[PDB]
Design an enzyme around this catalytic site. Structure first.
Site, PDB file in Angstrom:
ATOM      1  N   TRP A 200       0.889  -1.150   0.000  1.00 27.25           N
ATOM      2  CA  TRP A 200       0.000   0.000   0.000  1.00 27.25           C
ATOM      3  C   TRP A 200       0.948   1.227   0.000  1.00 27.25           C
ATOM      4  O   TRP A 200       1.717   1.433   0.952  1.00 27.25           O
ATOM      5  CB  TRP A 200      -0.894  -0.039   1.262  1.00 27.25           C
TER       6      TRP A 200
ATOM      7  N   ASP B 274      -0.210  -4.798   9.590  1.00 20.75           N
ATOM      8  CA  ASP B 274      -1.223  -3.908   9.061  1.00 20.75           C
ATOM      9  C   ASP B 274      -2.354  -4.879   8.791  1.00 20.75           C
ATOM     10  O   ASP B 274      -2.276  -5.707   7.872  1.00 20.75           O
ATOM     11  CB  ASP B 274      -0.779  -3.264   7.754  1.00 20.75           C
TER      12      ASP B 274
ATOM     13  N   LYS C 197     -12.993  -1.439   5.993  1.00 22.80           N
ATOM     14  CA  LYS C 197     -13.458  -2.337   4.942  1.00 22.80           C
ATOM     15  C   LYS C 197     -14.558  -3.303   5.385  1.00 22.80           C
ATOM     16  O   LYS C 197     -15.691  -3.231   4.907  1.00 22.80           O
ATOM     17  CB  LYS C 197     -12.277  -3.117   4.351  1.00 22.80           C
TER      18      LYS C 197
HETATM   19  C1  PMP Z   1      -3.059  -2.528   3.621  1.00 20.36           C
HETATM   20  C2  PMP Z   1      -3.708  -1.211   4.018  1.00 20.36           C
HETATM   21  N1  PMP Z   1      -3.424  -0.655   5.221  1.00 20.36           N
HETATM   22  C3  PMP Z   1      -4.162   0.380   5.702  1.00 20.36           C
HETATM   23  C4  PMP Z   1      -5.187   0.873   4.964  1.00 20.36           C
HETATM   24  C5  PMP Z   1      -6.040   1.928   5.566  1.00 20.36           C
HETATM   25  O1  PMP Z   1      -7.450   1.799   5.862  1.00 20.36           O
HETATM   26  P1  PMP Z   1      -8.021   3.133   6.533  1.00 20.36           P
HETATM   27  O2  PMP Z   1      -8.740   4.092   5.453  1.00 20.36           O
HETATM   28  O3  PMP Z   1      -8.959   2.639   7.542  1.00 20.36           O
HETATM   29  O4  PMP Z   1      -6.941   3.947   7.089  1.00 20.36           O
HETATM   30  C6  PMP Z   1      -5.450   0.370   3.717  1.00 20.36           C
HETATM   31  C7  PMP Z   1      -6.466   1.066   2.794  1.00 20.36           C
HETATM   32  N2  PMP Z   1      -7.202   0.101   2.134  1.00 20.36           N
HETATM   33  C8  PMP Z   1      -4.697  -0.696   3.250  1.00 20.36           C
HETATM   34  O5  PMP Z   1      -4.944  -1.267   2.045  1.00 20.36           O
HETATM   35  O1  GUA Z   2      -7.128   1.645  -2.949  1.00 17.98           O
HETATM   36  C1  GUA Z   2      -6.339   1.523  -1.982  1.00 17.98           C
HETATM   37  O2  GUA Z   2      -5.843   0.445  -1.655  1.00 17.98           O
HETATM   38  C2  GUA Z   2      -5.945   2.718  -1.178  1.00 17.98           C
HETATM   39  C3  GUA Z   2      -7.058   3.140  -0.225  1.00 17.98           C
HETATM   40  C4  GUA Z   2      -6.469   4.161   0.693  1.00 17.98           C
HETATM   41  C5  GUA Z   2      -7.487   5.006   1.389  1.00 17.98           C
HETATM   42  O3  GUA Z   2      -8.702   4.909   1.085  1.00 17.98           O
HETATM   43  O4  GUA Z   2      -7.054   5.794   2.249  1.00 17.98           O
END
Ligand code: PMP
Ligand code: GUA
Ligand code: PMP
Ligand code: GUA
Lengths: 396, 396
Positions: free
Chosen positions: A130, A211, A246
């Site tokens: 990410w 994570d 998510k």
């Molecule tokens: C692996 C990973 N870590 C952290 C996050 C963050 O989620 P959030 O918007 O809750 O910060 C994401 C976003 N999809 C992600 O893919």
């Molecule tokens: O598409 C992604 O994996 C990033 C999402 C990050 C966010 O929404 O902050």
């Protein structure tokens, strides 16, 4: 003064959105969203959260501040979700959870914690990972090293190159793992690679920072944690940043947590206080809403049953869109085994398209994918699976 | 490893809470809360927000992510609340607002912005000021200088010492002002001191950073901004961190904003993009809830009318608890003019009690005040005003 400030670059995700929501050809498709979509192509709010919100709407009596660590009921729940129930971690009280503004906020606070209370200078992010990871860590002042991971050729977890690159890490470095649904490869370590990767982690003295953001999207809530749990059996200290954005569809309410595990109650309580100071200096206290929702749902046997079912629904949609994608291509006339797609977990996977291919796909067909050829499987419906696979083959 | 991490100290506010919610003498009183309480001694949730929440509960269709700057309707509203309606600032588009996780989050992001895009090394906080200010700024890596402010003897705004200490500031430093209701003195610059303090601010080249968090608690929404507005007439660039945690009672939902004003549309949009990158690296996007509430209320002529009335109610309660406090003392037999209390705005003021007095008051009477002899006027009810003033006099 600001007049000479040089404008920032386009985010490796967000840019698409705009050329998408502009693309005059309404027959378009967006696969670089990162967010979940149902058979409709909508990101609804979970019924369990709706019920949860009306409950709160009826029951809240004050909006007075939360503790720096947020709401207790939320903390204990995430703890049980991560480490399980009879987890000594919990029974011995060597884990402390803080409600943070999303997985990102959990990462950044673990960052600011580490970066200002320990000698941790570098954090080993995988290749790839990410994108915001680096920016987060670097903003803490820590350096981002990269350990190999993906196997571009075989589309898999190059374990060799993995352990290989990690040895260049000194005892004292934080190595960042993905609990499940590796964004963006969608490739994950088997219970066996994890265990070895965990034992080899204690031997070299790594500081694991998990994570955990797609828990429930690979196999299920319990299974998806067996990895973190494996590391948490061998390790006496670790940090886990979980995101409820998510699996509870609470994206914009910023719901997540930064759990801290230390050798014992006294050390964890001592360190955690410092973690708290890092938060008070960042945003003071966390946004109650998203967390209140998540706490009640998880603590209500009825409402939780619904949530669990809703999640398994999402899991299975994605978990079937992969097959539709793969076999539809085989019908559309593709000359390339895309089977590896089925093997992968979570919303993401690498289609294996060149940055060039993804460009002509957008430019000549209105299909949007991340430059990395990353494709969001949850943006695929049975309705658009047909023209999608069509365009893709036309550019293979 | 964490085992040698040295435990953090007690927060200059929070510690009280605990010895309070433990103090076996139920006849207690807490004046070091910083949060508002009604005639009941409860921190209710505004009816306008309740109506606002049911509306959203009925209307939200997705919890998909907000832009890094949050919701637009919220942004434009805060802008109008700060600079007014016909503000050129707005009409020329040289102001950009970002929804942040509270006033603190606004401060920290203005911090991380500045600290990583400008040569600003020190920020002039006043003496005294909200304690978390320093921690925020220092966490950005910036240094906190202190300009004189309070006049311990006369209980007032020592303007002389003020401009005096400020001259030691180099053109290029960020000077932190409090829009209204100076936490914790409760003493504020008159429209005239502001104007001079603003003109003298352009001449020396200060970078103004307004902490606006009690708007509506001094005289009213419009009046309370005439200061910021004065600086915003003379200055071509400035930053304002506003908090909706007090005036909308949304404390724990973390609602606030970091507005950025530059010379023109092009420069502000250029700088703001960098401000955005500072946020994506911190928590990605802001928590929708509190802001959705604040956006709809402010955009609904009916719901806003109610909110405005509710705020004026709060303003007047506090604005009358000061008199009750002052004259009740004069009756209880005090030998000290506490009139200065009436002159002060907002929830806070310095009683003028010694750290010793505040200690015996707690220890021997169960009255809790901040070590600084700071007393929260909104924690005073007609019911406890009598024993309160009683204890205080007994320790004078
Ligand atoms: C692996 C990973 N870590 C952290 C996050 C963050 O989620 P959030 O918007 O809750 O910060 C994401 C976003 N999809 C992600 O893919
Ligand atoms: O598409 C992604 O994996 C990033 C999402 C990050 C966010 O929404 O902050
Ligand atoms: C002057 C000042 N600035 C900022 C804040 C922060 O408010 P918030 O909890 O919304 O961050 C406070 C807290 N009352 C404050 O007094
Ligand atoms: O009492 C105060 O003035 C501090 C409040 C700070 C906070 O609630 O974060």
């Amino acid at each position: 003064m600001f007049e000479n400030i040089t404008a920032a670059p386009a985010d490796p995700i967000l840019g698409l959105a705009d050329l998408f929501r502009a693309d005059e050809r309404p027959g378009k498709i967006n696969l670089g969203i990162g967010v979940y979509k149902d058979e409709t192509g909508k990101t609804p709010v979970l019924t369990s959260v709706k019920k949860a919100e009306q409950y709160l709407l009826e029951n809240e009596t004050t909006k007075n501040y939360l503790g720096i660590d947020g709401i207790p009921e939320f903390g204990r729940c995430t703890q049980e979700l991560l480490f399980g129930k009879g987890s000594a971690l919990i029974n011995d009280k060597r884990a402390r959870t803080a409600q943070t503004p999303g997985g990102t906020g959990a990462l950044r606070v673990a960052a600011d914690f580490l970066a200002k209370n320990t000698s941790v200078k570098r954090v080993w992010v995988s290749n790839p990972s990410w994108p915001n990871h680096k920016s987060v860590f670097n903003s803490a002042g820590l350096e981002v090293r990269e350990y190999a991971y993906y196997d571009a050729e075989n589309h898999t977890l190059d374990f060799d190159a993995l352990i290989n690159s990690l040895n260049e890490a000194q005892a004292g470095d934080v190595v960042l793992f993905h609990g499940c649904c590796h964004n963006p490869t969608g490739i994950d370590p088997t219970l066996e690679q994890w265990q070895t990767l965990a034992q080899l982690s204690v031997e070299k003295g790594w500081l694991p920072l998990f994570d955990f953001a797609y828990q429930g999207f690979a196999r299920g809530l319990e299974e998806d944690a067996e990895g973190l749990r494996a590391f948490a059996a061998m390790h006496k200290e670790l940090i886990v940043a979980s995101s409820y954005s998510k699996n509870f569809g609470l994206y914009n309410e910023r719901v997540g947590a930064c759990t801290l595990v230390a050798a014992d109650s006294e050390t964890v309580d001592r360190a955690f206080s410092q973690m708290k100071a890092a938060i008070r200096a960042n945003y003071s206290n966390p946004p109650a809403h998203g967390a209140s929702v998540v706490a009640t749902i998880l603590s209500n046997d009825a409402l939780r049953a619904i949530w669990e079912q809703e999640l398994t629904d999402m899991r299975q949609r994605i978990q079937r869109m992969r097959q539709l994608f793969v076999n539809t291509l085989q019908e559309k006339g593709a000359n390339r085994d895309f089977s590896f797609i089925i093997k992968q977990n979570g919303m993401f996977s690498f289609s294996g398209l060149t940055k060039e291919q993804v460009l002509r796909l957008r430019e000549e067909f209105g299909v949007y994918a991340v430059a990395s050829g990353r494709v969001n499987v949850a943006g695929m419906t049975p309705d658009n699976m047909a023209p999608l696979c069509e365009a893709i083959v036309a550019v293979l």
